[PDB]
Design a protein around this ligand. Structure first.
Ligand SMILES: Nc1nc(OCc2ccccc2)c2nc[nH]c2n1
Ligand SMILES: [Zn+2]
Length: 158
Protein backbone atom coordinates (compact mmCIF):
# COMPACT_ATOMS: atom_id res chain seq x y z
CA UNK A 1 0.00 0.00 0.00
CA UNK A 2 0.84 3.76 -0.10
CA UNK A 3 1.02 5.87 -3.24
CA UNK A 4 4.76 5.56 -3.88
CA UNK A 5 6.91 8.13 -5.68
CA UNK A 6 10.61 7.48 -6.34
CA UNK A 7 13.37 10.04 -6.94
CA UNK A 8 17.13 10.06 -7.41
CA UNK A 9 20.05 12.10 -6.13
CA UNK A 10 23.79 12.15 -6.80
CA UNK A 11 26.02 12.06 -3.74
CA UNK A 12 29.68 11.42 -2.94
CA UNK A 13 28.53 7.91 -2.04
CA UNK A 14 26.96 7.36 -5.46
CA UNK A 15 23.34 7.55 -6.55
CA UNK A 16 20.67 7.56 -3.85
CA UNK A 17 17.08 6.58 -4.59
CA UNK A 18 14.49 8.03 -2.27
CA UNK A 19 10.99 6.57 -2.15
CA UNK A 20 7.97 8.09 -0.41
CA UNK A 21 4.26 8.81 -0.20
CA UNK A 22 2.34 12.02 0.79
CA UNK A 23 2.51 11.01 4.44
CA UNK A 24 6.28 10.54 4.55
CA UNK A 25 9.62 9.36 3.37
CA UNK A 26 9.71 5.54 3.24
CA UNK A 27 13.22 4.53 2.09
CA UNK A 28 16.68 5.79 1.17
CA UNK A 29 18.42 3.23 -1.02
CA UNK A 30 21.97 3.19 -2.39
CA UNK A 31 21.83 2.45 -6.13
CA UNK A 32 25.60 1.74 -5.98
CA UNK A 33 12.16 22.47 -2.84
CA UNK A 34 8.90 22.42 -0.79
CA UNK A 35 6.64 20.75 1.82
CA UNK A 36 6.38 17.20 0.31
CA UNK A 37 8.32 14.63 2.41
CA UNK A 38 10.34 13.47 -0.58
CA UNK A 39 11.42 17.06 -1.35
CA UNK A 40 12.31 17.78 2.27
CA UNK A 41 14.34 14.52 2.30
CA UNK A 42 16.20 15.47 -0.88
CA UNK A 43 17.05 18.91 0.50
CA UNK A 44 18.15 17.43 3.86
CA UNK A 45 20.52 14.90 2.23
CA UNK A 46 21.93 17.49 -0.14
CA UNK A 47 22.61 19.78 2.82
CA UNK A 48 24.17 16.84 4.72
CA UNK A 49 26.75 16.38 1.97
CA UNK A 50 27.24 19.89 0.62
CA UNK A 51 26.22 22.36 3.34
CA UNK A 52 26.84 20.31 6.52
CA UNK A 53 27.34 23.44 8.70
CA UNK A 54 23.63 24.24 8.11
CA UNK A 55 22.28 20.68 8.58
CA UNK A 56 20.34 21.50 11.81
CA UNK A 57 18.45 24.21 9.91
CA UNK A 58 16.90 21.78 7.39
CA UNK A 59 13.50 20.28 8.25
CA UNK A 60 13.53 16.52 8.89
CA UNK A 61 10.92 14.83 6.61
CA UNK A 62 7.99 12.89 8.03
CA UNK A 63 8.68 9.18 7.91
CA UNK A 64 6.10 6.65 6.75
CA UNK A 65 7.88 3.33 6.30
CA UNK A 66 5.72 0.74 8.13
CA UNK A 67 8.34 0.48 10.97
CA UNK A 68 7.37 4.09 11.93
CA UNK A 69 3.63 3.36 11.76
CA UNK A 70 3.39 1.15 14.89
CA UNK A 71 4.78 1.30 18.41
CA UNK A 72 7.84 -0.97 18.91
CA UNK A 73 11.32 -1.09 20.45
CA UNK A 74 12.69 -0.95 16.89
CA UNK A 75 10.74 2.25 16.32
CA UNK A 76 12.11 3.66 19.56
CA UNK A 77 15.69 2.80 18.53
CA UNK A 78 15.35 4.65 15.23
CA UNK A 79 13.32 7.59 16.55
CA UNK A 80 15.57 8.16 19.58
CA UNK A 81 18.76 7.86 17.46
CA UNK A 82 17.32 10.45 15.08
CA UNK A 83 16.20 12.83 17.86
CA UNK A 84 19.27 12.64 20.15
CA UNK A 85 22.49 11.74 18.31
CA UNK A 86 23.78 14.72 16.40
CA UNK A 87 26.26 15.37 13.55
CA UNK A 88 29.81 14.65 14.82
CA UNK A 89 28.75 12.42 17.78
CA UNK A 90 28.62 8.67 18.31
CA UNK A 91 26.75 6.55 20.86
CA UNK A 92 27.32 2.91 21.82
CA UNK A 93 24.83 0.13 20.96
CA UNK A 94 24.42 -0.40 24.70
CA UNK A 95 23.63 3.19 25.55
CA UNK A 96 21.19 3.36 22.62
CA UNK A 97 19.43 0.21 23.89
CA UNK A 98 18.89 1.98 27.21
CA UNK A 99 17.75 5.22 25.54
CA UNK A 100 15.18 3.10 23.57
CA UNK A 101 13.80 1.61 26.81
CA UNK A 102 15.59 -1.73 27.10
CA UNK A 103 19.00 -1.50 28.76
CA UNK A 104 21.50 -4.20 27.77
CA UNK A 105 19.54 -5.21 24.64
CA UNK A 106 22.59 -4.68 22.43
CA UNK A 107 21.84 -7.51 19.94
CA UNK A 108 18.24 -6.28 19.51
CA UNK A 109 19.61 -2.77 18.79
CA UNK A 110 21.94 -4.17 16.14
CA UNK A 111 19.03 -6.00 14.48
CA UNK A 112 16.87 -2.83 14.61
CA UNK A 113 19.66 -0.76 13.03
CA UNK A 114 20.17 -3.34 10.26
CA UNK A 115 16.45 -2.77 9.39
CA UNK A 116 16.80 1.08 9.20
CA UNK A 117 14.99 2.03 5.95
CA UNK A 118 16.40 5.60 5.93
CA UNK A 119 20.21 5.46 6.52
CA UNK A 120 22.28 8.67 7.00
CA UNK A 121 19.09 10.63 7.85
CA UNK A 122 18.56 8.21 10.67
CA UNK A 123 22.21 8.08 11.61
CA UNK A 124 22.93 4.35 12.12
CA UNK A 125 26.55 5.17 11.16
CA UNK A 126 26.83 7.00 14.56
CA UNK A 127 26.15 3.85 16.59
CA UNK A 128 29.40 2.12 17.54
CA UNK A 129 30.41 -0.85 19.71
CA UNK A 130 32.53 1.24 22.04
CA UNK A 131 35.18 3.88 22.44
CA UNK A 132 37.79 2.12 20.24
CA UNK A 133 35.56 -0.12 18.23
CA UNK A 134 33.48 1.39 15.43
CA UNK A 135 31.22 -1.71 15.38
CA UNK A 136 29.24 -2.97 12.35
CA UNK A 137 27.25 -1.77 9.33
CA UNK A 138 25.07 -3.00 6.45
CA UNK A 139 27.38 -3.55 3.46
CA UNK A 140 30.67 -3.17 5.39
CA UNK A 141 32.62 -0.61 7.32
CA UNK A 142 33.95 1.66 4.59
CA UNK A 143 30.79 3.75 4.14
CA UNK A 144 30.24 3.93 7.93
CA UNK A 145 33.80 5.16 8.47
CA UNK A 146 33.57 7.60 5.51
CA UNK A 147 30.44 9.21 7.04
CA UNK A 148 32.20 9.55 10.42
CA UNK A 149 35.20 11.18 8.74
CA UNK A 150 32.84 13.57 6.90
CA UNK A 151 31.51 14.49 10.36
CA UNK A 152 35.01 14.96 11.75
CA UNK A 153 34.86 12.06 14.23
CA UNK A 154 37.95 10.37 15.61
CA UNK A 155 36.50 6.96 14.63
CA UNK A 156 36.07 8.05 10.99
CA UNK A 157 38.43 7.06 8.17
CA UNK A 158 38.27 8.65 4.73
N1 LIG B 1 25.34 0.88 13.51
C1 LIG B 1 25.05 -0.26 12.85
N2 LIG B 1 24.33 -0.12 11.70
C2 LIG B 1 23.98 -1.16 10.93
O1 LIG B 1 23.28 -0.94 9.77
C3 LIG B 1 22.75 0.34 9.40
C4 LIG B 1 22.38 0.38 7.92
C5 LIG B 1 21.10 0.02 7.50
C6 LIG B 1 20.78 0.07 6.14
C7 LIG B 1 21.72 0.49 5.19
C8 LIG B 1 23.01 0.87 5.60
C9 LIG B 1 23.33 0.80 6.97
C10 LIG B 1 24.38 -2.51 11.39
N3 LIG B 1 24.25 -3.78 10.96
C11 LIG B 1 24.86 -4.58 11.89
N4 LIG B 1 25.41 -3.86 12.92
C12 LIG B 1 25.13 -2.58 12.66
N5 LIG B 1 25.46 -1.47 13.35
ZN1 LIG C 1 3.39 5.88 3.20
Amino acid sequence: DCEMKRTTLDSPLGKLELSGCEQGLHEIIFLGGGPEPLMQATAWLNAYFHQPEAIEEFPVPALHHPVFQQESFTRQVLWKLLKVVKFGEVISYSHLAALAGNPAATAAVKTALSGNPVPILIPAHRVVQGDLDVGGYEGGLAVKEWLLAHEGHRLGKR
